């Protein structure tokens, strides 16, 4: 008499009505709203709901009946009969899978959280109960590092193929092709057309390996793509409600084996939206973040309520994070260029620069004259213009023809646009900032009978997922950017073992030749204690070699993957060296600064000693060096380095350990060896260096063919030289100080690929101290051990104890600062 339950819609005689006239009258029964409307609009069943009489309008049910009929609320267990929901259950170990027939290899689900920044979860942490339970109980890390641009098609596309976009070709939302002369949009037709999406999308590798796919939303999944769809996929459309996506994921596990997808995908556009309309620290985030907890927690007791809750593989993951936009950090080019009409410029903090005329002046274009022209205006500029091929290389942003030839790299918090016209509010969330950047940084947990639980992993890839489905799903994984088997500790039962890849030939000898010494026109300083008998100072007995490798190679000696390429090893008392006849240079020195080792300040510059190992070559003479404008050398192993003496190390001034540098680069060489060496020593208790030389021409971050590089040397004093594109550095020193870099229990390894410019216009040298731009110039050059590998055509510490899986975790690291 005083309740709804039961009379929804029936007239009454006593007091309080439960019709649809009762609002206006202001005479409804207390529950009216809950009982009879509410469950028109809520997937929820609630205290108002147990037992309700069926209602026919009504999303799903609360009845009696509602498990006969299988149409219960996800959640009615829990509220109705009392049961624990799945995030209320403690964490328990899932060892065995426990799957129905056709899940003899259990199905993975792809989860997105658009925008969802690592630091949500850091901060937030208390107020997310389910995805706080999955860290919890799952495999987690504290950031998952996005690929550049920190865009949404990009990371989306670049996590289900593991490729860089520069390979996958979708390189941002917006892109214009020269060759198709076409312009892509994710509003416009240009979306669904296949020339667009390159590498193999996991539903495509699942495909050709039997298994079948169910896309709710993903950036490729509603393309035809090596001709194929994925077996059950939706035409991207963000009105549909998230209830409807988890539910209808959750009746494509209820398929029979015949038709049930093995590999899923489910995406929700927030809380990117809520980010970029109130910013990433709102009241409208904390919402949108409980939100999509709401969501994961509504696919766990869906899973729990279908018995597979112990089978599927989840992995909950983001495409980038947030930051704060200003309208006080906007840059316009306007204010440098005038408001010119030839050119339009892609805005935001990943900001690219083409000709208006394309596709006609897309390669004429004067792109150098505008890189120079917007170059060091201001003290403390907040972008930086770049050619692509001088971007940092772990940033692997070059390659493809739809990347502008002209882009900006943005400082933290700071975007860019031609003028105020052609952006949208400054004042708004943004990202597509450099993928290191903490606010860039992504989401990722992993639960199910394939990972581990409790594990806490260091930061890791997107690119490295594609390989870790495969292995989820009993997949050979297509050719991709991922190291496969540099995730295997995130894995219970790891499916790849890795092997250190194999050097083709045998390091070639170069053995002493009796020749006469020649002059090579150094005019040397008196200090240096010269070579008196080359034949004596390097013929080493057994014993001696054996003191010498242990010191300098105590990870092995980087091997050589090349093809058609001839090394010999060149021994030394202070470092060894790979020596390319092919390219009269070392590919790589090693050598080990110890903790009280001498760094000379003594002038060591035009001397030279010939090296009788080697033919003597015109380019290896200090007279075809002196007053030339065009290049300059210097030395792989540093001559300033002595651990016998306090005066200049003579055996680093042989022609073998010496490489064209450019006089600007020579600014950069000089402090990393004078200065930040000397303090790395200090501090890390000594450090194992290798350096060499990098040729990439072709900007694509690999070692280019010596076919390729015939065509590539310069004509310098009637001479062909090869100048190098970049130089390389690998430090390895022990993550405990306490041991020296030839006892590491544990490598803890820093590497940089440094770009090889006539100018240091890059660094904006003009009113600054030495010592501050060149340490910044390293940071922001710094890579991964496997980016030189790939750029060098080399691999180091094949030589470790530990197995090939931890190293491929060391070698795929990036450090942040
Ligand atoms: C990320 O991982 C990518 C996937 O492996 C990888 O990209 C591959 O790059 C290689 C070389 O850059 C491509 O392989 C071939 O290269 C040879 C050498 O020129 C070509 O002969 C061959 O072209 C072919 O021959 C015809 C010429 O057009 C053509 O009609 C044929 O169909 C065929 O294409 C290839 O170009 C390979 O295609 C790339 N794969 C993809 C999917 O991009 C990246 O190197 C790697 N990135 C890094 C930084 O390591
Ligand atoms: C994109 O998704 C939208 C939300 O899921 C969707 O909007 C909805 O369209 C349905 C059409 O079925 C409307 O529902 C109507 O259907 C019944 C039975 O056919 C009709 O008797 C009623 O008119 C009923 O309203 C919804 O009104 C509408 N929902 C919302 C929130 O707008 C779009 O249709 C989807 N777009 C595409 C491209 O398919
Ligand atoms: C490349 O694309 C542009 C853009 O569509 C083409 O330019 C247009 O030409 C059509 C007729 O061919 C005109 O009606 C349009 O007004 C033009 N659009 C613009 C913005 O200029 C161009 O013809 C295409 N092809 C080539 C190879 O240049
Ligand atoms: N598969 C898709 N196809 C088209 N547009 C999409 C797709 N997935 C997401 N979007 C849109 O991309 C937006 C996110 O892009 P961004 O603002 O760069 O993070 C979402 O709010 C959607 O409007
Ligand atoms: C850059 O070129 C523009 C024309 O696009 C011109 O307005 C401006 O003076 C130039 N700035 C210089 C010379 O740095
Ligand atoms: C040539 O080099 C010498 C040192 O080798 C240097 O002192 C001098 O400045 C240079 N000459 C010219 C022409 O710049
Ligand atoms: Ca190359
Ligand atoms: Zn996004
Ligand atoms: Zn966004």
């Known amino acids: 008499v005083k309740s709804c339950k039961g009379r929804c819609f029936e007239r009454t005689f006593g007091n309080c009505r439960c019709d649809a006239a009762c609002v206006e009258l202001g005479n409804c029964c207390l529950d009216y709203q809950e009982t009879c409307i509410e469950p028109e609009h809520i997937w929820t069943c609630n205290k108002f709901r147990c037992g309700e009489k069926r209602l026919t309008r009504s999303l799903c049910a609360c009845s009696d009946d509602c498990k006969d009929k299988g149409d219960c609320c996800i959640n009615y267990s829990s509220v109705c009969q009392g049961e624990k929901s799945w995030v209320e259950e403690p964490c328990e170990s899932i060892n065995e899978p426990q799957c129905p027939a056709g899940f003899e290899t259990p199905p993975t689900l792809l989860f997105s959280l658009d925008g969802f920044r690592a630091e949500?979860?850091?901060?937030?942490?208390?107020?997310?109960?389910?995805?706080?339970?999955?860290?919890?109980?799952?495999?987690?890390?504290?950031?998952?590092?996005?690929?550049?641009?920190?865009?949404?098609?990009?990371?989306?596309?670049?996590?289900?193929?593991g490729l860089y976009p520069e390979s996958h070709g979708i390189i941002?939302?917006?892109?214009?092709?020269?060759?198709?002369?076409?312009?892509?949009?994710?509003?416009?037709?240009?979306?669904?057309n296949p020339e667009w999406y390159k590498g193999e999308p996991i539903w495509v590798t699942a495909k050709y390996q039997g298994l079948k796919s169910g896309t709710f939303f993903w950036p490729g999944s509603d393309v035809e793509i090596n001709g194929i769809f994925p077996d059950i996929y939706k035409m991207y459309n963000g009105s549909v409600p998230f209830e409807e996506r988890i539910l209808a994921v959750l009746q494509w596990l209820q398929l029979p084996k015949d038709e049930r997808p093995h590999f899923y995908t489910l995406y929700l556009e927030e809380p990117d939206s809520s980010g970029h309309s109130y910013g990433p620290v709102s009241?409208?985030?904390?919402?949108?973040?409980?939100?999509?907890?709401?969501?994961?927690?509504?696919?766990?007791?869906?899973?729990?309520?279908?018995?597979?809750?112990?089978?599927?593989?989840?992995?909950?993951?983001?495409?980038?994070?947030?930051?704060?936009?200003?309208?006080?950090?906007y840059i316009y080019l306007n204010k440098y260029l005038g408001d010119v009409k030839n050119i339009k410029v892609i805005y935001g903090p990943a900001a690219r620069l083409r000709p208006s005329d394309v596709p006609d002046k897309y390669y004429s274009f004067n792109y150098e004259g505008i890189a120079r022209n917007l170059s060091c205006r201001e003290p403390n500029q907040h972008f930086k213009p770049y050619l692509k091929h001088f971007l940092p290389k772990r940033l692997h942003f070059a390659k493809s023809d739809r990347i502008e030839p002209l882009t900006f790299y943005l400082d933290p918090q700071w975007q860019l646009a031609l003028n105020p016209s052609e952006r949208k509010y400054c004042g708004s969330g943004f990202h597509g900032s450099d993928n290191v950047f903490s606010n860039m940084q992504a989401l990722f947990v992993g639960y199910g009978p394939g990972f581990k639980h409790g594990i806490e992993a260091d930061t890791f890839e997107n690119i490295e997922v594609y390989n870790l489905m495969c292995?989820?799903?009993?997949?050979?994984?297509?050719?991709?950017?991922?190291?496969?088997?540099?995730?295997?500790?995130?894995?219970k039962n790891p499916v790849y073992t890795p092997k250190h890849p194999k050097e083709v030939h045998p390091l070639v000898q170069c053995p002493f030749t009796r020749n006469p010494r020649d002059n090579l026109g150094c005019s040397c300083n008196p200090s240096i204690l010269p070579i008196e008998d080359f034949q004596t100072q390097f013929?080493?007995?057994?014993?001696?070699?054996?003191?010498?490798?242990?010191?300098?190679?105590?990870?092995?000696?980087?091997?050589?993957?090349?093809?058609?390429?001839?090394?010999?090893?060149?021994?030394?008392?202070?470092?060894?060296?790979?020596?390319?006849?092919?390219?009269?240079?070392?590919?790589?020195?090693?050598?080990?600064?110890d903790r009280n080792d001498s760094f000379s300040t003594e002038d060591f510059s035009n001397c030279l000693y010939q090296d009788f190992r080697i033919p003597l070559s015109p380019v290896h003479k200090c007279s075809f060096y002196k007053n030339n404008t065009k290049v300059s050398y210097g030395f792989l192993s540093p001559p300033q380095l002595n651990k016998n003496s306090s005066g200049i190390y003579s055996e680093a001034l042989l022609?073998?350990?010496?490489?064209?540098?450019?006089?600007?680069?020579?600014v950069i060489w000089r402090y990393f060896h004078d200065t930040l060496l000397r303090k790395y020593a200090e501090e890390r208790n000594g450090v194992n260096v290798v350096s060499?030389?990098?040729?990439?021409?072709?900007?694509?971050?690999?070692?280019?063919?010596?076919?390729?590089?015939?065509?590539?040397?310069?004509?310098?004093?009637?001479?062909?030289?090869?100048?190098?594109?970049?130089?390389?550095?690998?430090?390895?020193?022990?993550?405990?100080?306490?041991?020296?870099?030839?006892?590491?229990?544990?490598?803890?390894?820093?590497?940089?690929i440094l770009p090889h410019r006539t100018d240091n216009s890059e660094s904006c040298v003009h009113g600054k101290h030495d010592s501050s731009w060149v340490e910044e110039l390293l940071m922001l050059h710094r890579a991964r051990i496997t980016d030189v590998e790939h750029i060098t055509g080399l691999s180091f510490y094949q030589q470790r104890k530990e197995p090939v899986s931890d190293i491929l975790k060391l070698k795929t690291h990036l450090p942040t600062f």
Request: glycine fraction near 6%; hydrophobic fraction near 35%; include cysteine.
């Open 655 to 666: 022609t073998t350990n010496i490489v064209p540098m450019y006089q600007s680069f020579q």
């Open 539 to 593: 013929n080493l007995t057994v014993a001696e070699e054996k003191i010498i490798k242990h010191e300098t190679l105590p990870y092995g000696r980087p091997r050589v993957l090349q093809k058609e390429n001839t090394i010999c090893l060149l021994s030394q008392h202070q470092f060894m060296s790979g020596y390319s006849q092919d390219i009269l240079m070392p590919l790589w020195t090693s050598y080990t600064v």
């Open 471 to 491: 292995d989820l799903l009993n997949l050979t994984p297509a050719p991709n950017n991922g190291t496969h088997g540099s995730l295997n500790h995130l894995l």
């Open 120 to 161: 949500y979860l850091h901060t937030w942490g208390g107020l997310l109960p389910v995805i706080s339970k999955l860290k919890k109980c799952g495999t987690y890390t504290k950031n998952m590092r996005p690929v550049y641009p920190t865009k949404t098609f990009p990371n989306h596309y670049s996590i289900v193929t």
């Open 692 to 752: 060499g030389p990098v040729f990439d021409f072709d900007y694509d971050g690999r070692c280019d063919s010596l076919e390729n590089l015939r065509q590539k040397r310069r004509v310098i004093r009637n001479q062909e030289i090869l100048i190098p594109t970049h130089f390389f550095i690998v430090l390895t020193s022990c993550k405990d100080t306490s041991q020296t870099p030839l006892h590491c229990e544990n490598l803890d390894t820093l590497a940089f």
């Open 283 to 329: 009241s409208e985030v904390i919402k949108a973040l409980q939100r999509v907890d709401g969501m994961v927690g509504m696919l766990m007791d869906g899973l729990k309520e279908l018995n597979l809750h112990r089978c599927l593989n989840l992995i909950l993951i983001s495409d980038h994070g947030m930051e704060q936009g200003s309208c006080k950090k």
């Open 172 to 192: 941002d939302n917006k892109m214009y092709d020269p060759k198709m002369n076409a312009s892509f949009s994710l509003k416009s037709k240009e979306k669904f």
